[PDB]
Amino acid sequence: IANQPVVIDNGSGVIKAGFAGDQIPKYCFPNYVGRPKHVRVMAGALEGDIFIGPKAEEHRGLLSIRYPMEHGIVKDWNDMERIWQYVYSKEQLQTFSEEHPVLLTEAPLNPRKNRERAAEVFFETFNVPALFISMQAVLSLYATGRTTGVVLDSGDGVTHAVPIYEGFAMPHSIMRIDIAGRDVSRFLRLYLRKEGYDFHSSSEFEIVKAIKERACYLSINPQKDETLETEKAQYYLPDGSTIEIGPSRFRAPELLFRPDLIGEESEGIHEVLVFAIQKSDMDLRRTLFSNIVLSGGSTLFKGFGDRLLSEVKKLAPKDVKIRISAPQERLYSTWIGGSILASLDTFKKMWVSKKEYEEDGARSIHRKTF
Amino acid sequence: IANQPVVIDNGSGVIKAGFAGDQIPKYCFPNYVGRPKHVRVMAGALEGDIFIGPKAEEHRGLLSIRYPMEHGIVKDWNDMERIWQYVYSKEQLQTFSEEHPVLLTEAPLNPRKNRERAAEVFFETFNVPALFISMQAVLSLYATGRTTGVVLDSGDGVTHAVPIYEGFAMPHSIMRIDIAGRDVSRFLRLYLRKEGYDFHSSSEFEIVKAIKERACYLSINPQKDETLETEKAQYYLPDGSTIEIGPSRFRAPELLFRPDLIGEESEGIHEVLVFAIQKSDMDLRRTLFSNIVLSGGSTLFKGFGDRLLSEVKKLAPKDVKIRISAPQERLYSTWIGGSILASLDTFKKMWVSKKEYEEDGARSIHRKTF
Amino acid sequence: VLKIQVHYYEDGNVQLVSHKDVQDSVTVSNEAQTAKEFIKIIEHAENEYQTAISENYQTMSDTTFKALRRQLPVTRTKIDWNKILSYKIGK
């Protein structure tokens, strides 16, 4: 049973899906489960009472949105099962789970219990013929067409700098933080309350994400922007009322570089990138500096790459050629790589078959990934 | 010019005033500006047509009362200027604003524009020599004598939990809601309409507050009280007519613990207290649980502390010593600490002088507070 | 007894030094069994050792090395120097 395999690229913020050997993921939607706050009085209302994807985006105000996955670690397993069922259902894929092999993705260095429980869901609840979990950085390099280079990424949950050199993903040199787009959105929400405009509701939380996506920019010199007084630019909400954003827009994405502002000890994106290069061998450092690939949604801030280049110039040894490259479609970089990896004839060897899982168990899944 | 400084402890419901070094605030009155509804035909009437303090409390029925403050955030600035002018006037303090330095208070995580506009009023309209703005939680611990511990408060506007450890108010663990005494009084009013007795007028609203102050208890088990049938205890209004209150008295203060009743997905008092301790560090949690201080008027319900203990037992980790301490004068706990802070010699270093404000501006006020 | 040693000397030194003393009682039976029994004792001990040596230190050293000096203060805020130079504590 070697049908066209499916590539479900997981993520805390957004979840991508579709078939192998494709240019773009056809099925992209945000990873959450909306449920109705209000009392459904009238007959002929929205049926089901568990909303995922575009229906939930259309009907935000009704639904109490909650995310199942934080920092690449699922909290609510029943919610992720409903999301995966919605992916396979007629509203999105129009396929059965029994036909196609599965390509899953996860952030590196996660708890193994969650990886085991993920496999249990795919093999038992769904009747998958073969499963395969993989890295995000390895796929992003397959999407670009390079083998050597570091992959800095920044989704909604995790930020991790994975160094790879000619098909050798060093498991030891992988740096990681639990600081990312969701924490930046939460930090921007806190700043908007300091400005004046309070947002506490779960449906109203996605307006803060929309403001973060649209009206934000990362300054090169933060001390210079602190001394100067801001212009206070405007933005229209979904309702109609205008909001002067003020200094919150530029101080919000500083969290990624300065993790002390939220109140939690971490390295930072720029430190993690330097740190992933340093932990590798001495001969391979200069090739890793030359090939730095960006990925994820939280790398799309204005003057983000320029700030990363300046931070590398400050920390790294002098007289070294720095190059932070990036693809055009930074959001769909990991999925394209999975679609390429799935289309290859080698893919049959790597996967965990259902028969092999039934015989061995979790140990076979731990062996095949690394 | 280092005269005996004035401590104006601002509050949404009640405002406290007096001089530094005293045991109690001598001048306490409700924070609103009453203005006459009816037309004045006869001579020898109440002159001025702007009523603040005991005159407004005496003659409620005449006056269309409106509060300038809402959730620790002044909406009507002209009304607060008139209140502050009334505080300093001969009817209350019998002093000039030119002589004495001013200690002011505000809730945490408020609009910075309101803090600037507060400072502008005190420095320009009044001619203050030196101003200082402070938190409520820091002062309450100064009043008790402790340094470490959490301060849960529940005024008329804001409920906020701030954890402090050895004279270090933790900014990133500050939890806050806009659910408080005024919202409980508003929720009680809505319940009394469901019972039968409506109170639509603004002068008539203070009858609902008086009912809330006297006849409201917090039951330990809400599901058990819902299944049982109430006794329907009586209450006499200022007119003389009887009111059978019924189940509205015990379901009214449930708003603070269950904010889903008003139609506003918030945490609640007990969750805010747990969240403030959890956001702070692992080493400080057990000391923060042992030192929990209560303040504000909406902690004065019958069986409030007993319910808050039971909710902490439900949420917090097991086998940990819980202690919710409470002073005798909870309404004046924040003012007592300000009077103590003002009496100390180090208060001279902390304040913002008039000369320093004229040179720098708002930036110096933002620096000195934190 | 089971001793590890690692030494890194770039930009300054770091050393790993270790040992585990083990006392065990085994029962002799066969040549095939005694050959595969002792090896089994070594295999499990040296794995448990490496496991602890790798997995405890990556996490527990990070927390014990942090219990000595923390990465950020008890407030989790970078200390304000202006605050330090114009604030008073105590009673």
Ligand SMILES: Nc1ncnc2c1ncn2[C@@H]1O[C@H](COP(=O)(O)OP(=O)(O)O)[C@@H](O)[C@H]1O
């Ligand atoms: N243009 C943008 N500017 C800033 N942030 C963005 C932008 N687009 C998306 N984001 C943020 O990045 C997140 C999407 O990142 P993504 O890589 O899809 O996460 P994951 O790796 O978990 O799938 C969103 O939740 C959003 O907050």
Ligand SMILES: Nc1ncnc2c1ncn2[C@@H]1O[C@H](COP(=O)(O)OP(=O)(O)O)[C@@H](O)[C@H]1O
């Ligand atoms: N004994 C009481 N029982 C219940 N509620 C009370 C009681 N006393 C006062 N309140 C409520 O608390 C409010 C006073 O809160 P206060 O301590 O002045 O806080 P703030 O200074 O933030 O206004 C009043 O408006 C009233 O509604």
